[PDB]
Design an enzyme around this catalytic site. Structure first.
Site, PDB file in Angstrom:
ATOM      1  N   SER A  98       0.845  -1.207   0.000  1.00  0.00           N
ATOM      2  CA  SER A  98       0.000   0.000   0.000  1.00  0.00           C
ATOM      3  C   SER A  98       0.888   1.268   0.000  1.00  0.00           C
ATOM      4  CB  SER A  98      -0.932  -0.065   1.226  1.00  0.00           C
ATOM      5  OG  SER A  98      -2.011   0.855   1.072  1.00  0.00           O
ATOM      6  N   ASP A 230     -10.019  -5.424  -4.165  1.00  0.00           N
ATOM      7  CA  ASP A 230      -9.435  -4.276  -3.484  1.00  0.00           C
ATOM      8  C   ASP A 230     -10.316  -3.039  -3.702  1.00  0.00           C
ATOM      9  OD1 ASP A 230      -7.815  -2.168  -2.593  1.00  0.00           O
ATOM     10  OD2 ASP A 230      -5.992  -3.280  -2.988  1.00  0.00           O
ATOM     11  N   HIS A 259      -8.030  -4.950   0.139  1.00  0.00           N
ATOM     12  CA  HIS A 259      -6.769  -4.219   0.258  1.00  0.00           C
ATOM     13  C   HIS A 259      -5.912  -4.757   1.415  1.00  0.00           C
ATOM     14  CE1 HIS A 259      -4.060  -1.104  -0.843  1.00  0.00           C
ATOM     15  NE2 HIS A 259      -4.048  -0.578   0.371  1.00  0.00           N
TER      16      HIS A 259
HETATM   17  C1  LIG Z   1      -2.434   1.602   2.252  1.00  0.00           C
HETATM   18  O1  LIG Z   1      -2.332   0.799   3.450  1.00  0.00           O
HETATM   19  O2  LIG Z   1      -1.599   2.785   2.359  1.00  0.00           O
HETATM   20  C2  LIG Z   1      -2.302   3.859   1.715  1.00  0.00           C
HETATM   21  C3  LIG Z   1      -1.891   4.014   0.244  1.00  0.00           C
HETATM   22  C4  LIG Z   1      -2.785   3.225  -0.700  1.00  0.00           C
HETATM   23  C5  LIG Z   1      -4.114   3.223  -0.496  1.00  0.00           C
HETATM   24  C6  LIG Z   1      -4.599   4.004   0.701  1.00  0.00           C
HETATM   25  C7  LIG Z   1      -3.776   3.505   1.891  1.00  0.00           C
HETATM   26  O3  LIG Z   1      -3.787   2.072   2.032  1.00  0.00           O
END
Ligand SMILES: *[C@@]1(O)O[C@H]2CC=CC[C@H]2O1
Ligand SMILES: *[C@@]1(O)O[C@H]2CC=CC[C@H]2O1
Ligand SMILES: *[C@@]1(O)O[C@H]2CC=CC[C@H]2O1
Lengths: 279, 279, 279
Positions: A98, A230, A259
């Site tokens: 992420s 996701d 996610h």
């Molecule tokens: C992850 O965990 O970090 C941020 C960046 C991507 C999507 C939003 C958030 O989720």
């Protein structure tokens, strides 16, 4: 442990980190708004496989300095650069989840890949998340405006809403994540710097397309992995484009995963990492 | 405060501690998966009695380094040794609760008792908790296998289950412990190192019978205290055997008390400690 | 960041602090039992206005040393003195909320006002909260005895009860504060030193009337602001008396606001601070 990466006025900016095991170094870079312990289901497997596993907490999160400044990927990459140089790590496997996928690409772009053995991008931001005239595949800006407003509006209530979509709780609560584990995610989230709840949103939507070029041109073993359900980083706006741009990378779609798949689909993530690291 | 006790790769292993009051030193060593503040109902009474009260957090717990290595009583005793030497404590009263009873016995066995005035063992592990061919009074191994699996499986949900049995919540919730105090126990628990949720289980079931010999042979005033409704460390598998092995120790059974009796039966624990320390 | 302000036995007493932005320094001093992040709705506005915003956590609270000693305003003021001297702050705007209003007055009384540009007192303790023969306008001592007993009795349950009255939750839960934000207040509260839950109560009821004389005689721009539905510090026992004693101060009554008005009435607090700082 702590590594100093800069200063904010009279205070050193210190990143909390852990450094465990023996063997080839593997650095795991967590997602918003968690910390290095969010990797626990991966960490314990990598240690068992004979890797030295290092995690650190991004500035503003977990045990790291709760700064007001530097919530951008040039800074996040400079922080990672200082971690790697301070620990003098070589032959490192970098693994981002992420937000952490942004550190990986920006780091290679800004500092090169002399220290890097392999790159693994899990639930990635790349290549460029926000819709623009020159980026028609992105998500409309109004989505991010709304997230910023909610996170600034009341971060405590916002983190609850975020985790519902992060984990797909309507589907997964009680089957792939417990209520108690969700509570643990929220307790970690509210420990982050108040400003970090929303200051990171512009960073998420930076253009990484030039960084993706640097990654591809490095010619190091690369893995891209994403869940097909996701609801934070839509697979068509991220991983499928990333895969098209870096066709040489190993590519894994985890069927049905949200996610927050380090937890909900730990087995699938671990199997992919085990195969990839063994190469 | 912090005391350095070793290193884990590039990081110092630091134990968080507090050092309060004036008078004869009393070191309180907490149980899993809490921290030094879990002693608060005892600490404030000992301070009022004119003791210098020191607590520290075991490695992996509370404010101490969240290490991967050293979850064994030889290491836990070496940590305690370093605390006592660093602070140059003499005439110390050592008081252990639950896991902390292991530090006391292993410390005397490995380092002797020159610094020690008295020993108090509350809700003890001793003498040897797991059933073996040469230890028929112990609890079957499968119990500990199941605990390890649950704690590794999802530590967040596991700590909820653990505290139900720790405090006997069916009996005691709303009468001897509030919902809010249980929540406070859980918030502290989830701050421990992920690996520590299960890595300590083999340590709990170490053989302390040789250490019990060292304790008895030291000839220092000793107290052994246990609840009769302890559903974590059954009284017949622990305290009653410990009492048989060290008949010279003062011995207290707290009628109706669970494992978590520092809180639920603070008055009885405090009365026993007050009498014992006054000797 | 940390600033050392003293020692408790073998441990340094360290106050956690943050130092952000650029411009005239503004030091925000939080209320019981919160920490510097409780100012987040004010901090972000002051930073946007071009001030350098510093917060620190009072001893016993947030990230600061969890001491047993020094829960009195002479010590709290000495701590503030050390913060200001260590950072060599000049032309400082001091802003206190709830307990923090005691630091402001005691600091001016004990150390003078050479470093101070302006003083803002939000939801103030002054002038003297407890009823005495020479203080007929105060609140009867039995109120504070009861608070001390509850906070010592079970701080976890006590903080729940405290926050109900702090925020006027019967009126404001779901309209001016979310359940999640209340939970965030409670999570911060239980991280404070166990003894600090009740040790601060005698400090709240210190006589500040001589300190109020020092404040008035300093002749620096002063603001006094209070909610009219404050059920922690009744407006007639505090702010209205403070206003009578320091008639030169700017004076704001926030209609309908509870004690916890930095959050529930952030807009009104921010508007008052913006006007005041612009002078
Ligand atoms: C992850 O965990 O970090 C941020 C960046 C991507 C999507 C939003 C958030 O989720
Ligand atoms: C205490 O608190 O610590 C450990 C060791 C003994 C029983 C299990 C757990 O409880
Ligand atoms: C604030 O937040 O701090 C203390 C002092 C004044 C009233 C009680 C408590 O509230």
């Amino acid at each position: 442990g702590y590594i100093t990466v800069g200063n904010e006025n009279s205070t050193p900016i210190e990143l909390y980190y852990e450094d465990q095991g023996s063997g080839q170094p593997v650095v795991l870079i967590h997602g918003y708004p968690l910390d290095g312990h969010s990797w626990e289901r991966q960490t314990r497997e990598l240690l068992a496989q004979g890797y030295r596993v290092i995690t650190y907490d991004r500035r503003g999160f977990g045990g790291s300095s709760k700064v007001n400044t530097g919530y951008d990927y040039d800074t996040f990459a400079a922080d990672l650069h200082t971690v790697l140089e301070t620990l003098d790590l070589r032959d490192v496997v970098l693994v981002g989840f992420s937000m952490g996928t942004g550190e990986l690409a920006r780091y290679v772009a800004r500092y090169g890949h002399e220290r890097v053995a392999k790159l693994a991008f899990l639930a990635s931001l790349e290549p460029f998340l926000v819709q623009r005239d020159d980026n028609p595949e992105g998500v409309p800006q109004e989505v991010f405006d709304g997230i910023e407003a909610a996170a600034k509006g009341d971060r405590f209530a916002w983190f609850t809403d975020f985790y519902k979509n992060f984990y797909n709780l309507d589907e997964n609560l009680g089957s792939r994540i417990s209520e108690q584990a969700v509570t643990g995610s929220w307790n970690v989230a509210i420990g982050s710097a108040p400003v970090a709840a929303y200051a990171v949103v512009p960073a998420w939507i930076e253009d990484f397309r030039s960084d993706v070029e640097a990654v591809r041109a490095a010619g190091k073993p690369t893995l891209i992995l994403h869940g097909t359900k996701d609801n934070i980083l839509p697979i068509d706006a991220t991983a499928r484009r990333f895969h098209q741009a870096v066709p040489e990378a190993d590519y894994v779609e985890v069927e049905g995963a949200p996610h927050g798949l380090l937890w909900t689909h730990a087995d699938e993530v671990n199997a992919a990492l085990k195969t990839f690291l063994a190469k």
